[PDB]
Amino acid sequence: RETLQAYDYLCRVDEAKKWIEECLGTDLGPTSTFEQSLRNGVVLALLVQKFQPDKLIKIFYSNELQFRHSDNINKFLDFIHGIGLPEIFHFELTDIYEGKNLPKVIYCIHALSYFLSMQDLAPPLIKSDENLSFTDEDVSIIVRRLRQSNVILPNFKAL
Ligand SMILES: [Br-]
Ligand SMILES: [Br-]
Ligand SMILES: [Br-]
Ligand SMILES: [Br-]
Ligand SMILES: [Br-]
Ligand SMILES: [Br-]
Ligand SMILES: [Br-]
Ligand SMILES: [Br-]
Ligand SMILES: [Br-]
Ligand SMILES: [Br-]
Ligand SMILES: [Br-]
C-alpha cells in the first residue's frame, strides 16, 4: 500500500511537471526533485508572465533560497486569486517556502491546469502513461518522506 501510494504521488508530480514544461516550452529536470525546485518561486512566477504577457513580472534570481524568494511565490498566489481559481485549491507561503506541504503545490498546479485547459487558455494536463516508472530508490524516498510527514495527500482524484 505504501509503495503504490508513493508511486501514484510521483505520477501526480510528473504530470504537473510535464504540463508546466509544455506551457513554458522548456525542460524542468527530474521529477523526484521537481517539488523542491519550485520553492524559489521562479518557475511559478514565469507561469504568471506567460498568462500576463502585457505585464512586466518582477522575478528575484538567486541560487540561495532566501526570504526575497517569497515575492516570486506571492506573484503566483495573487494570480490564481486574481483569475478566480477557487480558494480551496490555493496553498500558503509556508507550504512551499518552508516546504511544509509541497503536495498542496502540486495539487494547486493540477487544479489550475484544469481551470485553464477547460477554457482553452492553456493545454490540458496529460494523465501519466500506465507503464510510466521511477527507480526503486526514488519511490522509497517518497515512502520515507510520507512516513515522517504528517500531512495528508490532497484529493487529486476528485479533480
Ligand atoms: Br507500485
Ligand atoms: Br493520486
Ligand atoms: Br512563456
Ligand atoms: Br500572448
Ligand atoms: Br510584478
Ligand atoms: Br472560493
Ligand atoms: Br475549477
Ligand atoms: Br497555450
Ligand atoms: Br524525509
Ligand atoms: Br510531504
Ligand atoms: Br488522479
Side-chain angles (χ1 to χ4, degrees):
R1 67 159 78 63
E2 272 192 307
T3 288
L4 175 72
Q5 176 187 54
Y7 169 80
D8 281 344
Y9 180 62
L10 275 173
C11 289
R12 307 289 84 79
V13 181
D14 194 65
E15 293 160 3
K17 188 189 69 173
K18 295 174 309 160
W19 181 72
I20 295 179
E21 290 181 312
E22 198 177 5
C23 287
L24 302 180
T26 340
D27 191 299
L28 299 176
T31 288
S32 60
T33 53
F34 183 66
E35 298 156 87
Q36 287 290 317
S37 67
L38 298 174
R39 297 179 69 196
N40 68 21
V42 173
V43 167
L44 292 174
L46 284 171
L47 222 43
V48 176
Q49 181 59 82
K50 173 199 181 72
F51 299 119
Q52 305 215 289
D54 64 316
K55 294 302 196 304
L56 293 175
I57 187 172
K58 299 166 300 173
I59 304 178
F60 175 61
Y61 289 95
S62 171
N63 292 177
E64 283 192 62
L65 183 62
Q66 45 186 293
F67 187 83
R68 277 195 280 161
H69 277 292
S70 298
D71 294 317
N72 296 336
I73 307 296
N74 290 338
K75 299 291 168 57
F76 180 82
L77 295 173
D78 290 333
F79 171 69
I80 61 179
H81 175 64
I83 61 176
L85 181 73
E87 299 178 15
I88 184 182
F89 298 126
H90 299 11
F91 61 70
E92 316 295 353
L93 183 59
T94 320
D95 299 320
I96 183 169
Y97 184 61
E98 296 175 49
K100 71 182 184 173
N101 205 327
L102 286 170
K104 186 171 303 181
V105 171
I106 300 309
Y107 178 61
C108 175
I109 291 175
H110 277 239
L112 180 67
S113 75
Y114 286 100
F115 185 73
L116 302 180
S117 69
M118 282 302 149
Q119 293 178 60
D120 298 335
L121 296 177
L125 178 148
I126 308 297
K127 302 174 298 169
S128 65
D129 184 273
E130 278 274 291
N131 289 292
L132 166 72
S133 63
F134 307 88
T135 62
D136 300 317
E137 291 72 25
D138 283 345
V139 183
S140 306
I141 289 299
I142 302 298
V143 173
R144 174 171 172 271
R145 209 220 288 177
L146 299 182
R147 286 198 187 177
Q148 315 192 317
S149 183
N150 264 59
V151 303
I152 309 302
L153 295 184
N155 196 345
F156 294 96
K157 199 180 301 184
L159 295 178

